[PDB]
Amino acid sequence: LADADAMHAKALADAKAESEKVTEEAKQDSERIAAQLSEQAGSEAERIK
């Protein structure tokens, strides 16, 4: 039971760490997607010009 509680705590800590890491990775992915979408929009605008 003591080991199970300790493993619960350790797994919860690793879980929150993984959640934060994936959130940061998703934020970076969203930044890249927004940047490339804006660049593509600029390319489309100049093509229309």
């Binding site: 929009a41 489309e44 605008a45 229309i48 010009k49």
Partner: protein, 52 residues
């Protein structure tokens, strides 16, 4: 892209208006010149330099 299309249409219409004015005001200018072209064509076809 919608804004770009709108401004492209705007510049297109302004350019079309200015080009129409240009053509209208250059037709009169070349009206005097076309007489020389006609006279020279007549000279070539006739085989002699027709002055009229």
């Amino acid at each position: 892209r919608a804004q770009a299309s709108g401004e492209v249409a705007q510049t297109l219409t302004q350019a079309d208006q200015q080009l129409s004015a240009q053509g209208d005001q250059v037709r009169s200018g070349l009206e005097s010149s076309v007489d020389g072209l006609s006279a020279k064509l007549a000279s070539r076809i006739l085989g002699v330099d027709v002055n009229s």
